[PDB]
Amino acid sequence: PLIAAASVIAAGLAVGLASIGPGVGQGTAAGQAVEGIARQPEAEGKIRGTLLLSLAFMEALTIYGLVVALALLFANPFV
Amino acid sequence: PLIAAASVIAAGLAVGLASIGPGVGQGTAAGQAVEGIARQPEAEGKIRGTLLLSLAFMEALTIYGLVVALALLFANPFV
Amino acid sequence: PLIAAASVIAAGLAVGLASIGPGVGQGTAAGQAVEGIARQPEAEGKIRGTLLLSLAFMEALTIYGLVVALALLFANPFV
Amino acid sequence: PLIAAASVIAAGLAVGLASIGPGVGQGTAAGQAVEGIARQPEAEGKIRGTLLLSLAFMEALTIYGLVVALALLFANPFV
Amino acid sequence: PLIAAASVIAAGLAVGLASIGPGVGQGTAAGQAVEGIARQPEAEGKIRGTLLLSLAFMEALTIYGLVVALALLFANPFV
Amino acid sequence: PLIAAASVIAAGLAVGLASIGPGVGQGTAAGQAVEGIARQPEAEGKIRGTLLLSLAFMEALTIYGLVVALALLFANPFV
Amino acid sequence: PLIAAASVIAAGLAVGLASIGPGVGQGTAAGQAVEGIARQPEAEGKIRGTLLLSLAFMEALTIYGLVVALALLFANPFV
Amino acid sequence: PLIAAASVIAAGLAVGLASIGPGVGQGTAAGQAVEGIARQPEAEGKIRGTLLLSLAFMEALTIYGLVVALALLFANPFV
Amino acid sequence: PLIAAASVIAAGLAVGLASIGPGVGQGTAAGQAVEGIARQPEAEGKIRGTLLLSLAFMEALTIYGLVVALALLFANPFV
Amino acid sequence: PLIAAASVIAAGLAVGLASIGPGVGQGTAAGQAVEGIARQPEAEGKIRGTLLLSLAFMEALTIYGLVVALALLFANPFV
Amino acid sequence: PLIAAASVIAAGLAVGLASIGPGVGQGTAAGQAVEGIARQPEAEGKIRGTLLLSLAFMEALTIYGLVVALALLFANPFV
Amino acid sequence: PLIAAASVIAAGLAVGLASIGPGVGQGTAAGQAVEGIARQPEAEGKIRGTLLLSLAFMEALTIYGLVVALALLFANPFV
Amino acid sequence: PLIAAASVIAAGLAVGLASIGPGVGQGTAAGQAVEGIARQPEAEGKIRGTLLLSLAFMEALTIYGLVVALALLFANPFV
Amino acid sequence: PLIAAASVIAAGLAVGLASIGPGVGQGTAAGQAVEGIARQPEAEGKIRGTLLLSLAFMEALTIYGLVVALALLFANPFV
Amino acid sequence: VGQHFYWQIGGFQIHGQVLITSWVVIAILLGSAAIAVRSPQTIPTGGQNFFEYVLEFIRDVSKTQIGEEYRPWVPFIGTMFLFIFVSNWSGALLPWKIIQLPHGELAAPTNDINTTVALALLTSVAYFYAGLTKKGLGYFGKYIQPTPILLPINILEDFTKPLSLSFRLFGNILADELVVVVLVSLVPLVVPIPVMFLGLFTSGIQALIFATLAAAYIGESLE
Amino acid sequence: NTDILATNLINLSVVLGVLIFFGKGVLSDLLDNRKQRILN
Amino acid sequence: IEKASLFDFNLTLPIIMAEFLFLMFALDKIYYTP
Amino acid sequence: MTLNLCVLTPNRSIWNSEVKEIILSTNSGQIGVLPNHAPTATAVDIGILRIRLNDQWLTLALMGGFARIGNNEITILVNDAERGSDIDPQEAQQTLEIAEANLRKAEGKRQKIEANLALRRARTRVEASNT
């Protein structure tokens, strides 16, 4: 009825909105991480160690928007 | 009824909106933490100590939005 | 009825909206805290004492929006 | 009826909107407070006295929105 | 009826919208007020006399949204 | 009826919106004022004599939003 | 009727948005003015003759919004 | 009827919207005119004759929004 | 009826919306015109010969919205 | 009927939207064109021959909205 | 009926929306092109050959919006 | 009916919206390309071979939206 | 019926929206690439190998919104 | 019915909305990655090894929106 | 208040106000200029300085925009400045709300499209006259020189050069006079006079930006 | 017929006056300076 | 009397093209050449 | 009464008389100066320096360096500088031709560094001989 139709719009708003914050975040992180290799390539493992760890924090923001968005579709307690 | 449909839309807006503030925040903090490594690689242990601690605060701004959005679905007092 | 449906929408807007400012704010405070460590690593104890004391304020701006977001669901005087 | 439902959405807006203005403000205030310490660390007590005083003004901007938002739920003269 | 429900939503926007103009303003004014102390620590007492008055003009912009929104709730001449 | 209900909403939008321009405006005027005291502390009285007049013009832009928002509620001709 | 309800909403939007353009404008025009006095303080009277003359043009942009917003309330030809 | 209610809302949108372009415009123009005076005072009269030259164009943009807002209220052909 | 009510709203938006580009543009073009006079004040007639030629192209953009906004009210082919 | 009411709203949108992109563009394009004159005044005619040729492209973007907004009114095939 | 009323609003949007993109783009592209002439006027034949070609790509973006917008009015297959 | 009215509004958003993203992008790409010719005119054919290939990718983003908008009108499978 | 009318609007919002993120993103990438060639032209085989590879990824973000938008129209399972 | 109509809209917001953050992100990531090659071309394999691993993260943000948008079309459980 | 007109019939309908308003500009242009060319002097006397400094100004905006061959096009650009400069300064300064025609207003010759689209075509013929005289009759500046696929961009540029140059001049004079028309209905004349001085400022400038840009299309056609 | 009313021409008065006076000023300043240049 | 109805392409365009070319030739003979 | 200005080479100070108007080229390209100019430190290009004092105005070519300005004082540090009149007019354009062929025979980096640096030294030497 209305419940399955309103759950399915928020499954698109959860993911659509969640993706936006991190996309700018993972871009300015990887943007200055590769500028940093150009100033000193001897710190590549120091940069790729911190970048791949901090990009995992921004992966965790939009994966929470997909935990909700799959819960609205699949494990939906309302329908 | 309407209450199940109104709760389920706000489950997507709570999570979706929450992801946006932090993504732009975990990107400017991470990008200037990796740029700070390339300026002086001796202080990686001080940079990773300040970055991962401050990324946990910005992670806490999103897990607030996941506590509410799952409480609208799972422990929903109104349905 | 309508009151339980209007209260459960604003719990997703109270929290979602609240997290946007701090996520953006705690990024630029932490990013110029770690850029400051690379400028002078000897002052980490003056920086972590200043960052975490000032990240505690921007953490409190979202917990104010979480107090209302939990008051609409759990300690709701209207329903 | 409709009055309690309109009061309970606005409680959410007052707190949610209030978080946004200060969140970005306390970021740039604390962000240049920590970068100032890395410029001259012997001026710390002049900085923490000026940071924590000025963060108290930006904490007042959100607590004005919270006093209204609690008064919509608890001390509501219209319901 | 409709008079009270419209008076209670506007009590949220007025307090809520007001925080945004000042929140960014009390940040970038006080943010360079702390960086200015790090450049010239001899001029602290000149800065705090200029800052605390200029923040009070920005505290007065938010207090106008409070006096209106408290007049929409408490001293409401329409109901 | 509708006349007092539409009047009371725009008493919240007149005042709330008014704060936004000045809140951001009085910040960057005070920000480059206090930064300027750090560069030349000997020119303080020329700065406060300019800032207290510059903040007075931007205080006037928001007090226009209060003159209407007091007129919509108290000296309301339509009700 | 509906005319008096639509004339009073636009009385808020007339000055609701009037403040927004100029406030932001009177900030950066007064912001670089006080930086100008702090740079060469012998040119103060060449600045206050230009600042007060250019803040008058932006105060005129908002007094246009106040004239309309007071025309909708008092000298309203439709009611 | 509907015509006098629709003409009166666009009287607020014409004026409010028109003011926004100029405030931003007369901030960057008049801001870099007073900074220019500080840099080269000898050129005050060459700046004021180019500033009030160009502030008259941006005052002319808002005066289009004023008179159309006066044409909807007073010289209205439709009612 | 609806034709005269729709024609009278869009005459407020055409004028208001069009004005935003010129206000924003006629300040950045007038901003770096006076900043150029401060550099080399000999080239003022070389700058005013281009500045007046530049601000009238942006006066042409607002005026196309005002050719329409007077054609919607006065030379209205539909009513 | 509705078609004359729908077409007259879009003529306020076509012109209004079109005016915005160019107003912002012709300020930044001519603003750096005047700054280029003040750097090398010996190349003024080299700049104006490139400026006015490129301002005619941004003027062409706005005028495509004036072609539509007059075709919605005068050469309207639907009414 | 509603088919021609929807097609006549959308034509307005397509021409209107397209201008915002290339309007800002042709101002930054022609803006740094003319600032590039003041660095080295010897390559003005190299600048104008690349500028006028690159503006034709941005001119093609809006004219793609006008091929659709004329096909909603003139060659409209639904009416 | 409703199918033809909804398929024609989306043709305005398909290309109206598509023009916005690329247009801003092709301004920064062409703007620093023509500045790059000013930096080193000896690599003009190295710049134009990269620019005209990279402008072809951004032009292909709007041509994707032009395919959809010319699919909703002419080769529309729903009518 | 209502299914095909709602599906066809999302066919315009998918690629309409998809064009916006990538176009802006692509422009900066090519913008600092070509100005990077003007710094060191012998690195062009390294630059074009990195630009044309990364322009394929931002192209791949748009083709995700195009595969959906063609699937809403052509291979639509609901109609 | 309403369920298949509300599901098919949100597949346009999911994939369409999702692309916006990453598109801006991959542009500023690969933007400074290529400018990094123009400073030190000997670190190309350090730059391409870091960029392409981080472009896969921003690929993973947008591919999350595709997974939900394909789950609304193909593996849609509500219909 | 009033955006209408009365028409005069000579087989077709033509505007009475436009012809009449324009005639005064013609009589004030020839009537004041030809009083100083009656007996010239070597050293310019009082009154001849202003008509010489105008003529030295027209040579500035012709030579800078056209080039070495500005000197045949001086009387054209000298008309397109002065017929548009004096037409706008007649609207603000000459008191014509005292005279009452029984059907319409009298402010300016350029308040209708019929003047402004004619002046946009008289400057459109001029760069097709200069474009087809100096260069070849077979192929001229519209020929697709940098790329062959620039054809619809350059065909449509032919239409936008008289059209955007017309509605620039048409609108800002119609706007300026209407602000005078509207604000008089609200308030006596002591309030709108700073707004009229903002209007009389741009009233002469839109004439100057006409003749500057009109010469700027001449030099484009000659290349 | 002539329409006599003191709500138009009065304003025209003030600004025409101002304009005239200052125009006189500037023309003296800019035409006499050109005359001294040609006499120079 | 009638309403506004501007955007009139009546014969005032050839009238004002004629009177403008008359002004350009007469003003030529009095001002520009002399 | 104005700004004073000194132009000093690594062995010899050229100008030390008060002037009202200079317009120096720079790495940006052109900067005009009037007195009461805010203190600014720029780098100067290898090009001409046009100076306008009371009646007569003249150009002194300078071969690039550093120009900072203060409280009505412009010191210009330039590693070689010649007055635009004291270069004989045609004779620089002979030496420009000695450079213009020498870049046509330039090969390798160091001959494309040395010719193009000395060409711009020579090409902005002739432009003072005519100014």
From Swiss-Prot, chains A, B, C, D, E, F, G, H, I, J, K, L, M, N:
Pfam families (alphabetical): ATP-synt_C
GO biological process annotations for this chain's record? Answer: proton motive force-driven ATP synthesis
Q: Where is this site: Reversibly protonated during proton transport?
A: 59
- Which CDD domains did the record assign? ATP-synt_Fo_c_ATPH (cd18183)
Which chain positions lie within coiled-coil regions?
none
**A GO cellular-component term linked to this record:** proton-transporting ATP synthase complex
**Keyword field contains Ribosomal protein:** no
Quaternary structure note? F-type ATPases have 2 components, F(1) - the catalytic core - and F(0) - the membrane proton channel. F(1) has five subunits: alpha(3), beta(3), gamma(1), delta(1), epsilon(1). F(0) has four main subunits: a(1), b(1), b'(1) and c(14). The alpha and beta chains form an alternating ring which encloses part of the gamma chain. F(1) is attached to F(0) by a central stalk formed by the gamma and epsilon chains, while a peripheral stalk is formed by the delta, b and b' chains.
Tell me more from the record. Answer: In plastids the F-type ATPase is also known as CF(1)CF(0).
Give the record's family classification.
Belongs to the ATPase C chain family.
State the protein's name. ATP synthase subunit c, chloroplastic
Q: Which gene encodes it?
A: atpH
Curated annotation (Swiss-Prot), chain O:
| Transmembrane annotation, as ranges | 17-37, 74-94, 113-133, 178-198, 199-219
This protein's gene is called atpI
Annotated membrane topology is: Multi-pass membrane protein
Q: Which organism is it from?
A: Spinacia oleracea
Q: Which molecular function GO terms apply here?
A: proton-transporting ATP synthase activity, rotational mechanism
Family of this protein: Belongs to the ATPase A chain family.
Record's GO cellular component, any one?
proton-transporting ATP synthase complex
Q: Where in the cell is it found?
A: Plastid, Chloroplast thylakoid membrane
Domain of life (superkingdom): Eukaryota
- State the protein's name: ATP synthase subunit a, chloroplastic
HAMAP family in the cross-refs:
ATP_synth_a_bact
PROSITE patterns for this protein: ATPASE_A
Swiss-Prot record, chain P:
Q: Which family is it part of? A: Belongs to the ATPase B chain family.
Described function: F(1)F(0) ATP synthase produces ATP from ADP in the presence of a proton or sodium gradient. F-type ATPases consist of two structural domains, F(1) containing the extramembraneous catalytic core and F(0) containing the membrane proton channel, linked together by a central stalk and a peripheral stalk. During catalysis, ATP synthesis in the catalytic domain of F(1) is coupled via a rotary mechanism of the central stalk subunits to proton translocation. Component of the F(0) channel, it forms part of the peripheral stalk, linking F(1) to F(0).
Task: Indicate where this protein resides in the cell.
Answer: Plastid, Chloroplast thylakoid membrane
Question: Which protein is depicted?
Answer: ATP synthase subunit b, chloroplastic
Q: Where is the signal peptide?
A: none
Q: Which GO terms describe its cellular component?
A: chloroplast thylakoid membrane; proton-transporting ATP synthase complex
On whether Hydrolase is a keyword of this UniProt record, the answer is: no
Q: What is its main location?
A: plastid
A single GO molecular function term of this UniProt record: proton-transporting ATP synthase activity, rotational mechanism
Keywords noted in UniProt: ATP synthesis, ATP-binding, CF(0), Chloroplast, Hydrogen ion transport, Ion transport, Membrane, Nucleotide-binding, Plastid, Thylakoid, Transmembrane, Transmembrane helix, Transport
Please state which portion of the whole protein this structure contains, as first and last residue out of the total length. Answer: 23 to 62 of 184
Where does the record place a coiled coil? Answer: none
Q: Where are the transmembrane segments?
A: 5-27
Misc remark for this entry?
In plastids the F-type ATPase is also known as CF(1)CF(0).
UniProtKB/Swiss-Prot annotation, chain R:
Q: How does it sit in the membrane?
A: Peripheral membrane protein
Q: Where is the signal peptide?
A: none
Please provide the Gene Ontology terms (biological process) for this protein: proton motive force-driven ATP synthesis
Check the record and name the Pfam families matching this protein.
ATP-synt_DE, ATP-synt_DE_N
Q: Which SUPFAM superfamilies match?
A: Epsilon subunit of F1F0-ATP synthase N-terminal domain
What InterPro entries does UniProt report for this protein, alphabetically? ATP_synth_F1_dsu/esu, ATP_synth_F1_dsu/esu_N, ATP_synth_F1_esu_C, ATPsynth_dsu/esu_N
Q: Which UniProt keywords apply?
A: ATP synthesis, CF(1), Chloroplast, Hydrogen ion transport, Ion transport, Membrane, Plastid, Thylakoid, Transport
Major place of residence: plastid
Kindly list the GO molecular function terms attached to this UniProt entry. Answer: ATP binding; proton-transporting ATP synthase activity, rotational mechanism
Its assembly, as annotated, is: F-type ATPases have 2 components, CF(1) - the catalytic core - and CF(0) - the membrane proton channel. CF(1) has five subunits: alpha(3), beta(3), gamma(1), delta(1), epsilon(1). CF(0) has three main subunits: a, b and c.
Biological role: Produces ATP from ADP in the presence of a proton gradient across the membrane.
Stated family? Belongs to the ATPase epsilon chain family.
What is the recorded name of this protein? ATP synthase epsilon chain, chloroplastic
Native organism is Spinacia oleracea
Gene name per UniProt: atpE
